[PDB]
C-alpha cells in the first residue's frame, strides 16, 4: 500500500522532470501547455536547483548528477531582469545548501561527485555575496527588489514583513557552513525589528506586528495584522529558528509562543452556516476581515510544529482544527482541490453561491489553483505529529486530485476553476515548488522513516525551510 502510493509519486516527479528536460532545461521552467520554456526566476535554472532536495530523497542518482552539472555552469552575478532578493533566497540559496547537508549527510552513498558536492556551497558563497548589497541601508532592514549590476532598487520606503523575516534561517546557516559570519550578522539585524516592534501601535496583540517596515529608520508603517501573503512566512521562522538551535534562537521561540496565543485569542473566527469550522482572519484597527488563502493553510503546520517542540496540547489542538478548515475547503469542490481565496462574511455571500456558502461554510473569491503546497504540507505535520492515518490519506487524495485534474503530456499545469469540471481552463504555468514542495511531501507522507523526515518533541535533526528544503539543524 503505502510503498506503491510512495513509488506512483516517484512516477508523477519522473513524469514533470521528462518534460521540463526536454522542452525547457536549462530555463528556469517548463510552460505545460504549449510545451515550451519560461525564465521568471532570472534564467538561472529554478526548477532544475528546486527539485535538487527532492530527487535526493527519492533516490533518483541520474537526476541528481545532472543537477549537480548544471549547478556548476551557473554565474550567479549575470541575469537581465530585476532581483527579488526573497524568491532568490528561498529557492535557489536553500536549495543548495539542502543539497549539500542531505549529500553530505543522510544521502552521503548515493552519487560520486564529491567536487559537485562541494560546489554547492561554494555557489551558495557566490549568490549571497552578489546579492548581500541588499542589506547595506540605514537601518539594516533591505531592498527586496534589487539590480544586481548597478545595485540600484525600484525605489520602495518600506519592505514587507514576509519578505525581510524569511531570509535569517538560509543566511545564518551559510555562515555557520563557511565560518564568516557576516551573512548571520546582515540577516539578523533586520530580523531584529521585528522582535522588537515599535512603535508599540504596530503591535496591536502581542507578538502580531504591521506588514510594512520603514527601510529608513526601522519602524513598522502599519498596524494591519495577517497571517496571508505578505505576512505569513516570518511567523513560520520565528519557530524554525528555535529548531534550528534553541540555544541560540529562545527569543524567537518566546515571541512566537505570544503570536500564536493572540492568535488563538483573536484571529481565530468560525462561519456563521458552519459553527464547526475554523479559519484565521486579518485585523486592522478594531475591524475583522472575514476572508483567507489558500497559502495561509501554512498556518497548522507551524502550530503543529511549535505544539510538538514546546509540548503544548492547546497549540497540537488549535493546528487540527485549521488543518480541517483547510480540509473543508478542499473536499468541497467538484475536483476535490481547494480555491486560491475565499470568504465567509455573512453580510457578503454572493446570492448565487448561498446554496453553497450554507452547505461548506465559505463562498469562493477565486477559484484558480497553482499548484500550491500550503495544505499538503500541513496534512503533513498533522500525521507526523498525531500519527493518524486519517491525515496520510488526506495528502493522497490531494495528490491524487491534482494528478487527474493537471496533468498534461509533459507535466503539470495550474488551472482556472476548482469547482469546475477538468478545472476549467489549464493555465501554461508550472512553478518550480511544483518539484521542490509538492512532490516532497506528498512522497514522505508514505515513505520511510529517515532522519529528514520531521519528527516530535525535540527529535528533529532537520529544519524545512519555507520552500520544502530540509536544512541540517546547527551544531
Ligand atoms: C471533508 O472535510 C471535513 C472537514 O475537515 C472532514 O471532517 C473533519 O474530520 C476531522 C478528522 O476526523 C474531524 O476531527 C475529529 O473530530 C472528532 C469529533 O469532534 C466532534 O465531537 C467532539 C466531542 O468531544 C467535539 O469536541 C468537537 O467539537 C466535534 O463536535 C474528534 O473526536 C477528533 O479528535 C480526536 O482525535 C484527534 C486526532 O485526530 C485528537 O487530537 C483528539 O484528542 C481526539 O482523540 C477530531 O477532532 C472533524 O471534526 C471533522 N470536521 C467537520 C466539520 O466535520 C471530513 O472527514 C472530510 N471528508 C472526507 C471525504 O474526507
Ligand atoms: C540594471 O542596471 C543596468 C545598469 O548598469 C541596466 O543596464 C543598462 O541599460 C541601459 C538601457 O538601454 C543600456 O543602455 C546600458 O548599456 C546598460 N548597462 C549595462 C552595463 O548593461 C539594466 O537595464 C538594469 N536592469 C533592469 C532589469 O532594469
Ligand atoms: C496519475 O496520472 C497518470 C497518467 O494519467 C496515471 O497513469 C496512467 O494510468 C493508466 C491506467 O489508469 C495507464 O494506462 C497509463 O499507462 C498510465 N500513464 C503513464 C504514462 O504512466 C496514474 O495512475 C495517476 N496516478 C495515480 C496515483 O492515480
Ligand atoms: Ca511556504
Redesign the pocket.
Known sequence: SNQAKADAVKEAFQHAWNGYMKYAFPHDELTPVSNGHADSRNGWGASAVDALSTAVIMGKADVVNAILEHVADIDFSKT???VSLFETTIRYLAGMLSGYDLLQGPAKNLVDNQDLIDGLLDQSRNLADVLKFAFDTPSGVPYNNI?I??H?NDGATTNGLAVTGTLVLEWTRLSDLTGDEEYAKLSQKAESYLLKPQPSSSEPFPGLVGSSININDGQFADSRVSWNGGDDSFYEYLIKMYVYDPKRFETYKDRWVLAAESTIKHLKSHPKSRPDLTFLSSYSNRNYDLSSQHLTCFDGGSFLLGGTVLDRQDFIDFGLELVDGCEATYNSTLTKIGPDSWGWDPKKVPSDQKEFYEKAGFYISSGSYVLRPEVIESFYYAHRVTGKEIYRDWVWNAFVAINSTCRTDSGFAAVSDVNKANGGSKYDNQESFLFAEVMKYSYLAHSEDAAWQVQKGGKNTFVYNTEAHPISVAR
Open positions: 537581465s531582469d530585476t539590480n549590476t548597478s540600484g
